[PDB]
Amino acid sequence: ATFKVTLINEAEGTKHEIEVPDDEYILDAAEEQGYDLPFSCRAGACSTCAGKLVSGTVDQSDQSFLDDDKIEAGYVLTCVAYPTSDVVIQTHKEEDLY
Ligand code: FES
Numbered sequence: 001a002t003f004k005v006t007l008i009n010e011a012e013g014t015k016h017e018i019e020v021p022d023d024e025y026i027l028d029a030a031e032e033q034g035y036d037l038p039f040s041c042r043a044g045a046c047s048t049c050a051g052k053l054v055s056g057t058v059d060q061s062d063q064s065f066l067d068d069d070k071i072e073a074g075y076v077l078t079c080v081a082y083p084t085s086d087v088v089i090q091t092h093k094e095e096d097l098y
Pocket residue numbers: 038039040041042043044045046047048049050065077078079080
């Protein structure tokens with residue numbers, strides 16, 4: 001399967017739509033498709049690539065930085081997140097954790 005992923009940058013008021021395979025991390029797909037997103041560790045151990053889900057679901061089982069509450073609040077580490085449905089997500093949300 002291939003899911004549609006809508007990336008929203010509220011601060012800049014931009015929107016990008018990309019198609020991501022069910023076995024590819026969002027970050028990777030976005031880059032390949034021409035959209036650079038913030039990142040640092042690239043390994044699910046930091047908050048640089050944080051995004052916030054608006055709708056849809058993902059699988060970010062490889063992540064380790066986010067606690068359960070953050071997860072419940074909809075936060076996602078885009079560098080290790082696989083879409084499990086069509087998703088709409090807000091990017092550049094790191095600030096939200098401080
Ligand atoms: S870039 Fe560090 S968790 Fe994604």
